[PDB]
């Protein structure tokens, strides 16, 4: 099990990542992009509404 | 006499219209407030669905 160097070089590069993930390393103008463009979409198929607490009602009776 | 007889039999059961009058108010009134309950349930449940998909 300590034999496979790659097993070992594998585990090694995602220590490296996981102490080097202050931020996104590599991300590029492409990881800020897409993050926008698809978060923008879900705020669309979700809603516009009160994005930090509880909308209120005030309902009609009949 | 029979007529008139049959007039206040119909008389007794009158109050049937105003009956479900009453039934449709309270009942109509109970389906908005089930409306209510259950619109805010969704409404919560997508807001924090949104949180969870983000």
């Known amino acids: 099990d300590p034999v496979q160097k790659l097993f070992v070089d594998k585990i090694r590069e995602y220590r490296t990542k996981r102490q080097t993930s202050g931020g996104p390393v590599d991300a590029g103008p492409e990881y800020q992009q897409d993050l926008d463009r698809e978060l923008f979409k879900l705020k669309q198929m979700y809603g516009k509404a009160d994005m930090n607490t509880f909308p209120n009602f005030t309902f009609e009776d009949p | ?54």
Do not use: C, G, P, W
Request: charged residues 30%; aromatic residues 10%; without cysteine.
């Open chain 2, 1 to 54: 006499i029979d007529m008139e007889k049959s007039q206040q039999a119909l008389v007794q059961k009158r109050h049937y219209l105003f009956d479900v009058q009453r039934n449709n108010i309270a009942m109509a009134l109970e389906v908005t407030y089930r409306e209510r309950l259950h619109r805010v349930y969704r409404e919560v449940k997508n807001r924090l669905d949104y949180h969870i998909s983000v």
